[PDB]
Assembly symmetry: D2
Homo-oligomer: 160 residues x 4
């Protein structure tokens, strides 16, 4: 019996660290694990499309995807793997800097056995944060960056 777990949150909330905590519990217990990272940001492979790691993923028990929002192919990938009998764990930002859905990641929710959304700390007033604020003027969805270009932010701070 396979499954899909989803780990949502803004930036700076530790989504990857949670994905890995989870994946490692299976590894220290001698399951074959694979962990897939977005090329542009136990086996561990960088990728831009999940097709590039599908045949490899078929040969393991536990799959982790970091930054799932960047993988247009993610919903079909996960559903097939889980139906293949694999444990699939996905870290993905829930929203863009506009607080809109980020890629195809939320269509994973109806298919997932578990869903959680983690918390950051507001970089502007130090309450809990659920959103990511883009600090500059660019308006395209994909702008790779860290605390240089982005602030994890609460609702008040978001709208300042």
């Amino acid at each position: 019996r396979g499954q899909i777990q989803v780990i949502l949150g803004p930036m700076f909330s530790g989504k990857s660290t949670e994905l890995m905590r989870r994946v490692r519990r299976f590894q220290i217990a001698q399951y074959k694990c694979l962990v897939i990272k977005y090329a542009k940001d136990m086996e561990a492979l960088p990728a831009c499309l999940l097709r590039d790691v599908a045949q490899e993923a078929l040969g393991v028990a536990v799959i982790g995807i970091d930054e799932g929002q960047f993988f247009p192919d993610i919903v079909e990938f996960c559903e097939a793997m889980a139906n293949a009998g694999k444990t699939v764990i996905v870290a993905a930002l829930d929203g863009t800097f506009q607080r809109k859905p980020f890629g195809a990641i939320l269509n994973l929710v109806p298919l997932a056995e578990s869903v959680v959304k983690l918390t950051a700390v507001c970089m502007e007033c130090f309450r809990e944060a659920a959103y990511t604020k883009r600090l500059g003027t660019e308006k395209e969805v994909e702008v790779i960056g860290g605390a240089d270009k982005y602030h994890s932010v609460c609702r008040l701070c978001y709208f300042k």
Copy 2:
């Protein structure tokens, strides 16, 4: 300061109870609460029925804490929740995440990017007795909205869903 909490789950997972437990905590500490139910689901603190949350906007505006039950049925929910939360209110939404076909139910998933907290609850599988994440329709009707209970639907794991 205002916020949106979201409670997802299959049918039979207690989303309404969890919604009432949260709202009641604020009420016993003397907040004004309002719970909104969907008018057309009658299979059984201000409590009010609604068909479009616009119906109850002025009543909502006069309270601290607002619960929305069966939130998948309100096509205006994003706009309503976001506006209330922005005015200072705590908003808590119980809602099914997927239809009988396991596809987004209504507009409810657009609330995720706007929400401070999101949980997904667990039912127990009515066919094998593992944990259940999905709802299966027993009959053959194909329209999305069919009000009903265990008569019409089973809470179901991945395995049983596809049997």
Copy 3:
């Protein structure tokens, strides 16, 4: 395979409501449930000692105990039931009005498969609350009461 789940929290945090949410999921799925309430505050029975409901508990699949802190007998009761193959779910206050362990309830933690501690809302400043404050001067552990005698309180408020 049986288990023990523990639901801790201060007063006014909905522990009973959570216990029942959990128990009801099993009932609507046609398991025999029993729910045991403290006599002094689906089958539902009031009790002062769990020995009075043990033989009955043997005949069901899912057992709930509300106010487990009041049952001196609780640890042995739960462990035996769970080892009998039953799902045992326990709501219990974690601490007294002095923030000390309340009865034998924390010896359930090492034996429990799951443990959570819920939150109330501070009745004095309206932040989250983890503690119960006794409003009057009595110093005995057991004083049955509601928001008449007690306030759910945060750490600051506790120490005012």
Copy 4:
């Protein structure tokens, strides 16, 4: 305002990772953090070894956020955490809840009544592959403290624990 978060679990459940994820959130937002490890467990942001948390009291006093790893080994933990939390600090404690015999480990359970949050984590059973809630000692030593890893211990469910 100060607080005590507690992370329990069997061995192999990631309590340390969860501890670091929480602490790192405060650090990336420019808080001063301190992580304390138990000196005698060397089987591999201020990080410091300790045997009694009194050792590191003055270093602790100069930071916003303090993590305590393997907290079951510090016989002074209640007093330390409660004092720091009362002085304004956020304190987060990873610790095992039970010994190899499933009895309270150290003083750690007395922290529960003082804590704002308590979670118990899950390992995976090393013998049947269900979820694991307990730790079993493979050998026959009977003293409580025996530093070691998968060599000496298995993370285990109720069923396998008693096999």
